Design an enzyme around this catalytic site. Structure first.
Site, PDB file in Angstrom:
ATOM      1  N   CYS A   1      19.783   5.502  16.297  1.00  0.00           N
ATOM      2  CA  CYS A   1      19.750   6.415  17.074  1.00  0.00           C
ATOM      3  C   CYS A   1      19.504   7.640  15.961  1.00  0.00           C
ATOM      4  CB  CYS A   1      20.157   7.415  18.607  1.00  0.00           C
ATOM      5  SG  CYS A   1      19.832   5.710  19.620  1.00  0.00           S
TER       6      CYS A   1
ATOM      7  N   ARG B   1      15.906  14.162  19.160  1.00  0.00           N
ATOM      8  CA  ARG B   1      16.800  12.612  19.098  1.00  0.00           C
ATOM      9  C   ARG B   1      15.503  11.881  18.425  1.00  0.00           C
ATOM     10  NH1 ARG B   1      19.097   9.440  23.413  1.00  0.00           N
ATOM     11  NH2 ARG B   1      20.086   8.122  21.524  1.00  0.00           N
TER      12      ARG B   1
END
Lengths: 323, 323, 323, 323
Positions: A1, A15
């Protein structure tokens, strides 16, 4: 991530969600009167409205990330082996990681308010249910002023100011910041020949200022490349150019299927990429298999409702056939 | 620029076009009976149909890249300081670089036919016009069997077999291939601790196999990263999954605005990214500010026409507003 | 500076001393009856004998590094901006950094004894004198079982187990160890082509397993290269071959004059390189301008004396003119 | 292997000899009237005197490297897989690689003279003997003005001007020079923070200007590090200080035993390191297990002799026991 903030007139937060398998991700709007019951702290019957992407596996909003109607964003990122959750501790606000985004975004309008709320936090090792144990995470929170990183590890709970507005996975945030020191020389401009004034070295390519920037898919490398790409980004202020630049930053550190084998040809890849406009309450997203940006505007709903509003994700390529 | 080929079930060809400014890019289908007048070789009154992106500044198809109706692709990529174009040479087929894509794609069904045609080529230094001098280029050609690189430099004309199906900018292709030798160790999987069996080193991140992969925007770095990403790509055989993976490969080496300053804040960036299905004659593209994939299908036109069929490029964000 | 331990049959300890200017560095044997007066702890009238290199001040052995007659070694390395020395703290053993090597080596036969002594340590900010303020340092200690690192920073005093037997300069030891994780792939053997099984990559050089190893003169890079070189070293048990290998390890991360400018062509360079045999009490050294190994054997002196025994260093090339 | 030139007041030439096993390496002075018989070109009954290290298994001086009495140096370095030796070609000066150092150094006083002599050279595939087939080599030649590289490959014979006075192993010299272009940014000084003016990056170490410099034992990495180290070396005030700096340059890229496994724990290592003073005709050397510099001065011999003067190498540690 990889999670980032970015400013271009409006302030954006979003994100890359990188994992092996898609678990029915949905965009979920939690309206103001959806009751939040917390296992060890006081309930929030009325709270700020929230929009984010959640795991569509429960009628509770299990958010991976989200923003609220006051312009505060929060994201949980994998932190495997580093995250440590605690026993219930008397005198503390005992909040489970699965409750943590609702707990903060429910009641804080700013990062400064979040900082005060976090002073007495103890993140406790209580599962949502037996069928669904806790994930090991750390968090980025952001508003239009600043961003912070929250890390609960074996040594304890730390809240860091984030001077670059970036977060990835392991190790701790202090190592990630420190490591940027090693990249001080990198530039958007062609470097001078500092190697030796005794020989002629040819500028055979544009972009030579950036040589040294790491391009692999590991957590530290993505932190360095996302930071350099975010900090050196230039856009245009208009919303569409602004989110375009944002998704370009996230693209720079996305994980392509096949390239990151986590064991037995099981591939970690960027399942979705989000970009949230904190001022307007719009959650924009792309997915691995749909390049078109999809936009869900929290303010188009009746935020005085008491039930979750779910938008299933557009996961097939949406092609504009021009002829 | 970065150009690639990729096979899933169908065979794909396409490129990132990286430059400071747009020359009015358009998608142009050249039908079969559009007469090609060549300055120094024989005319092609009837030829294969072609679809590609061109500079829309004239009633000639000034292609940056294209494919033809027989599944042959060709792209010109910046080769500044390395390209050298010649005087007219007796006994050669004297073809200007601006004519080169029409010359090859007009009359060749395969790379093997292109190889025979290129044995007699001499690329001559003849401008399209005074308003439009020649660009310094080199070329990638590809079909479903193979790809080649064509480079005209001061030492002469070289045609290389391309074992990785990738091309970027400078230097010569032989150095680009050779430099991959330095990256033999890179892997999609977690490496073993080869550093020393005397100490315990922690796998703190996925993707550590690729550490060493260069992430900067220079020509050589993009060649290595595009090659690694292309060769280790996986996707399913379906069209949408295949082009998804293709655009992900191109995204891996795109140039974000702000990051490559060639001047006084003059930025080289990926103006568009293309993906062509050689079997179906579909030209797909994204642009810097439109993340949605747009598709133009050459076979939906009347290919017996004798005039250029020109489509504007969709250059502003096409957002799916889900509420 | 770089300090290392290395085992062949005997156990060796030593360091590169890296600085801008050579002062009066001398090999100094402190005999057992040389009284150590400490500014805030109890005096040692009788103690273990020590040999090391010191700054050459009549009144006191100001050691840069040393070993004692029981096979315990200790070295102070520059730690600028990271070191923090404290106020006198009641209930602690308050020891100045300038006293620290005598304090430990005078009374400890092993690192385990040092560990117990260090539980009560507080390193205090007391200068040897006004004309000679404290240097910012951290320490490596080693015996034939193990080594440790001692670091007094703003957060406090930490004693780390050192699993690689290496130390350089900044940052903290925990970051230095962690960073080795990034080099798990490095090997003494030629790697397999993991990049792609679709293409042939030529092993054009020996030594390709090590590609990625940093070769610059910075603190972290020298830590990685010293570690890899030490851990992968091989040598015979014989003394000459063993110290040969040791000096080769130190040479691998030495600083050449001209290469490390710390401001206005003031160059940091490896003034001397030491190798101590812990079992035999021999201090061996080379200097920048004397490649021949010089040996000073502590057991050849009268260690029952009460006065410092000082030997000038052999600083000019000792050449064998063979014809 | 690594060969270099370096200027202080005098001009020096020398090399690391890197291989798996030491045979009977000897320092051999070839006097003026030692007749050189060439298999396919005219004999040199009277010629310049030469001193270098040779394989002491034959009555003919089989030099790995050498200098002559007129200040011209030449060294053969491994070039495996790249070297190609030819059939005898009429009209050329047909010289075997084993004869090549005697052929050049016998009759040339300068590199300019060597350049003229090399215009007609054809290096032929003739073994010295059956027991000793030809090695695959390329050559560095140097005098006080300049240096050149000679490389006989499949494509032919190429003589390059060498702007950096360094040579290692594979690949061809043109690629080696080109690759330096990638290191233009490296510096002996602390770089500015070009990464981003939005954040403070700490200079936590000296030597950060060199970050990026490769530290592994492969041929290209040693070429880059030797070049940077040589070009940025200071000059020095005396002979002793000058050769000290020279051996430090060679030490920077030496191969330590254990680090470069070419087989089943078969280690390539720096068997000897040479430094020759071109003006004085002194061959200095340091072996792997003898750190002391040994000097053999060609001018101390009777150079009107007609037989080789051969000195064994000092191969065991010569330690100065100072107490």
């Amino acid at each position: 991530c990889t999670a980032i903030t970015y400013v271009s007139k409006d302030h954006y937060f979003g994100r890359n969600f990188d994992y092996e398998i898609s678990y029915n991700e949905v965009v979920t709007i939690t309206p103001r009167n959806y009751k939040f019951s917390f296992r060890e702290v006081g309930n929030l019957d009325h709270h700020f409205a929230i929009i984010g992407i959640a795991a569509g596996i429960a009628d509770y909003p299990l958010y991976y990330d989200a923003i609220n109607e006051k312009g505060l964003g929060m994201a949980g990122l994998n932190f495997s082996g580093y995250a440590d959750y605690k026993k219930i501790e008397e005198g503390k606000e005992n909040v489970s990681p699965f409750e943590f985004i609702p707990w903060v975004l429910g009641q804080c309008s700013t990062v400064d308010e979040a900082k005060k709320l976090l002073k007495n936090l103890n993140l406790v090792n209580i599962n949502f249910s037996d069928e669904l144990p806790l994930s090991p995470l750390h968090w980025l929170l952001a508003d239009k002023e600043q961003s912070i990183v929250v890390e609960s590890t074996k040594e304890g709970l730390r809240v860091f100011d984030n001077p670059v507005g970036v977060l990835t996975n392991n190790p701790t945030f202090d190592y990630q910041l420190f490591n940027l020191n090693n990249y001080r020389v990198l530039s958007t401009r062609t470097p001078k020949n500092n190697f030796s004034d005794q020989i002629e070295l040819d500028i055979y390519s544009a972009g030579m200022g950036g040589i040294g920037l790491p391009g692999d898919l590991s957590s530290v490398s993505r932190f360095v490349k996302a930071t350099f790409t975010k900090l050196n980004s230039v856009s245009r202020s208009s919303e569409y150019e602004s989110i375009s630049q944002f998704f370009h930053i996230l693209s720079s550190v996305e994980q392509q299927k096949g390239l990151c084998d986590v064991g037995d040809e099981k591939y970690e890849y960027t399942i979705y990429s989000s970009c949230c406009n904190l001022e307007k309450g719009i959650y924009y997203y792309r997915t691995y298999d749909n390049s078109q940006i999809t936009a869900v505007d929290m303010n188009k709903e009746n935020l005085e409702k008491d039930s979750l509003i779910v938008y299933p994700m557009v996961e097939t390529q949406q092609i504009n056939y021009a002829n």
